[PDB]
């Protein structure tokens, strides 16, 4: 496809997800006045097309909470982390669509796809600019550290699907701290 027919493939199946409505193909196809075979072609299948989907609405989340983010360093990373995490937890189209499709999000999300690699740049890109502002010592490159990040804190942002009570958010952020090298002092 070319950048244009595929934006407005993504912009349609972003309206669905943001509506509440599950990602049907012959739907999508109808709407943007394809045939089924030339939607394959321009975004893959309904896994592939609903990874970016969500990918893009992961970096909208991230782009957010850096603007609205305090401090610098790890406080900064630590605020960062805490927003995006807090947000995906009080979304309402993606508790709907993982009411309806949780193995389909569990793999989106969990297993290396689009999720997690955008997740990792922009948290690699966090680091960088933190390193670069003289507020963050590491060891590891930032694109080591922001894949580590994302691959520690998911599964406790999304403990519920793995058969917990609840979005797991401080045991991610002392995961977090503890990767930093930083402590969190917690009381009550
Ligand atoms: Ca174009």
């Known amino acids: 496809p070319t950048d ?3 934006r407005r493939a993504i912009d349609t199946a972003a309206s669905m997800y943001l509506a509440e409505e599950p990602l049907d193909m012959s739907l999508l196809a109808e709407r943007l006045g394809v045939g089924r075979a030339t939607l394959y072609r321009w975004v893959g299948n309904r896994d592939e097309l609903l990874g970016t989907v969500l990918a893009e609405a992961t970096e909208r989340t991230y782009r957010k909470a850096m603007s609205q983010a305090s401090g610098q360093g790890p406080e900064y ?15 309402t189209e993606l508790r709907a669509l993982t009411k309806r499709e949780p193995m389909v999000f569990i793999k989106l999300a969990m297993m290396p796809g689009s999720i997690e690699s955008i997740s990792a740049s922009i948290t690699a890109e966090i680091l ?3 390193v670069d502002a003289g507020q963050l010592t590491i ?3 930032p694109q080591v550290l922001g894949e580590a990040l994302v691959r520690i804190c998911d599964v406790h942002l999304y403990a519920p699907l793995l058969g917990r009570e609840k979005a797991e958010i401080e045991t991610a952020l002392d995961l977090i701290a503890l990767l930093l090298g ?3 002092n917690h009381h009550h």
Not at 78 to 89: A, C, I, W
């Open 128 to 130: 960088q600019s933190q």
């Open 139 to 141: 060891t590891l490159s």
């Open 4 to 6: 244009l027919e595929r």
């Open 182 to 184: 930083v402590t969190r």
């Open 77 to 91: 990373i630590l605020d960062v982390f805490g927003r995006v995490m807090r947000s995906v937890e009080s979304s």
